[PDB]
Design a binder for this molecule. Structure first.
Ligand SMILES: [Cu+2]
Ligand SMILES: [Cu+2]
Ligand SMILES: [Cu+2]
Ligand SMILES: [Cu+2]
Ligand SMILES: [Cu+2]
Ligand SMILES: [Cu+2]
Ligand SMILES: [Cu+2]
Ligand SMILES: [Cu+2]
Ligand SMILES: [Cu+2]
Lengths: 281, 277, 278
């Protein structure tokens, strides 16, 4: 368990929007390495990120982010002329801030949390065609002293798919018992969902962990979520429950029946998962 | 500045009337009904007697979330507190401060972002009333709560915002640095997700973190369903500047079909950069 | 009526899946006595429960629980070979733990909460047919020092029904002004809902009560919920509002109109309910 540092760096990254195989659309850090979800962008509170965005598609595309600070010119919307023409580039600037006491004595909430970025202009002026086809990704903004995980996995319920995968194709993720595993969970599209994990639970607060015995946050294993909700958490793999093929699914019953399921495959230290037979899943 | 302790007995006249295009609304005076209805504001301890007159050709009622009331003011047919056409009735709403009970447990106060609506037009759950515009906000403040420079009410009623036509806002104006309060209420049949560009708030009572030990989540996108009510204050343009900041339901077809408005945050000189209407 | 003690007991119960009238299915503490929702199970953090389960149905059934600790062999899924053949029995073991600091120094959340159990194999391998027909029930896990209620009532929004009852049949629940009344609220199926109570409000946190003036938890009377969500709370009946037939309902408008409504009948001490006639 590492700790996030205080932020304040100016960082740059290149991002591209590209057609994938099978007619999907994705963001990536380098040409031909686009993915759904898009790449995970990580920052510490006070960091600034300059996203040099290139649009390789034949229609306008944009980049809009939740949670973080930006000026209207990096809104990523047609309304504010912040979309990128076919073949074009544009640098979007995202800023983040620490919490702190205002002059009026109130508390400014910081930028930290589990956030996301997505297209705002493909298909419609709300990015509906862009989101449908894969133009979304995760952003984590860490607070000084936050617990850092061994692994981070992103699970996007996009309409009736997980990460735009075909029905009943996961994804699955692997850990060893004792691993500190971070989930980022984002929802998109038209439908509400409930995200559930067998054998694991978390706090419904920013970090998904109680800060201590005086934290009143709720502890849950089932979370309602709708389009553009983003939350996250860290769990200790197999804590109190051990190894196995631990299902996660949307708990709306027809949704689980129609493919919104995957596996958190928690292994013993020797690499084994007793009983696990993929033919039975 | 800050809300005082409450404990005044307040009285107000409210009327239900027909508005243009067959809508129905609450107002403080005859001819002044609005959708949403007028904002009622109280401090915990306060009492409010609402002298309600029904000018419609159908029974109408007044039902309130969150506040204390006796059965004879629940605004239902069940407890005979609906108002016949042409009739009058006084509804009594009370509110209380928090404090410790004798068993050691803490009684929560009335404070919050609440709402009132009809419970008898169309059905005995007010379905047709609510659909037609018979709803409005009620804020109950706790002693010491920060007061805003302005309050705006946003209601997602089925696929409309404030019963308005698709893609007609409302828009709400503020100047950079203003302390702006939003009351956000949901009604009808559908779930929604309320999102604002450029701004975020805490998912707790006041929408602001009480300080560095407040573990309330900070969000920009909030799932809501029928009769949910929440609120928050944000500093307009804080860390982001002036501009036309969209807010919208984030369910995709809803935003596409017109559940979208603008939070127009002005520079001090009153202009809005980049804002081509 | 008291406070929860610290747990750490090994307990056992017997539970049966059986048919009920009309093709409903339920769990029961004894054969013949299945109910929908199933029997309330209550534990104190640290307790272990061995559930000695029998399937009296003609199709496989299972028992799966939210929140509690269980090893993979007690998953209650076909996928991990934890289901029960027709006429079969199996012991499912559920454990619970206290909050405390982990080895890595962070705070481990305890098992306490308002949880639930349900079938995961009837109709589909997510229990869709089981849940639909009534194979679900409440579990409460208490934290040492939690205040205990005078009564506990469970309300489940299962698709468009409450507790799989016919439309417009409540249920109704009775108390006396001043009673400490505990509500367990579970949702299943296909629909989101908003649970609303006239005359009463509760905190959107574990217990439904604020810890004290420093507890930032929201105070609400209207709670969005979806399939497999579970929350609970304790209210003082008629507190600041008095006696009467206090309505509770889903606030999604067509749902209340189509019969997801009941009454919280709060009696005066003489046992009467002002303004209410059957
Ligand atoms: Cu947007
Ligand atoms: Cu789903
Ligand atoms: Cu968005
Ligand atoms: Cu009602
Ligand atoms: Cu919507
Ligand atoms: Cu209501
Ligand atoms: Cu499951
Ligand atoms: Cu409902
Ligand atoms: Cu479940």
């Amino acid at each position: 368990a590492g700790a996030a540092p205080a932020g304040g760096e100016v960082r740059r990254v290149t991002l591209y929007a590209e057609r994938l195989a099978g007619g999907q659309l994705g963001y990536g850090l380098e040409k031909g390495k686009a993915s759904i979800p898009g790449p995970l962008i990580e920052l510490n509170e006070g960091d600034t990120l300059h996203v040099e965005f290139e649009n390789t598609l034949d229609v306008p595309v944009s980049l809009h982010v939740h949670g973080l600070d930006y000026e209207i010119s990096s809104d990523g919307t047609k309304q504010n002329k912040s979309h990128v023409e076919p073949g074009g580039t544009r640098t979007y600037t995202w800023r983040t801030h620490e919490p702190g006491r205002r002059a009026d004595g109130t508390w400014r909430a910081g930028s930290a949390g589990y956030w996301h970025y997505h297209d705002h202009v493909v298909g419609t002026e709300h990015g509906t065609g862009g989101i449908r086809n894969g133009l979304y990704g995760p952003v984590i903004v860490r607070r000084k002293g936050d617990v850092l995980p061994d692994a981070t996995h992103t699970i996007v319920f996009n309409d009736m798919t997980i990460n735009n995968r075909p029905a009943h194709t996961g994804p699955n993720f692997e850990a060893t018992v004792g691993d500190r595993v971070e989930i980022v969970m984002i929802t998109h599209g038209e439908y509400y969902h409930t995200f559930h994990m067998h054998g694991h639970r978390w706090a419904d607060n920013r970090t998904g962990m109680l800060t201590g015995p005086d934290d009143p946050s709720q502890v849950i294993d089932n979370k309602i979520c709708g389009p553009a909700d983003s939350f996250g958490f860290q769990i200790i793999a197999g804590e109190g429950v051990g190894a196995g093929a631990w299902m996660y699914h949307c708990h709306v019953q027809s949704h689980s029946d129609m493919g919104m399921v995957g596996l958190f495959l928690v292994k013993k230290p020797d690499g084994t998962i007793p009983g696990y037979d993929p033919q039975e899943h």
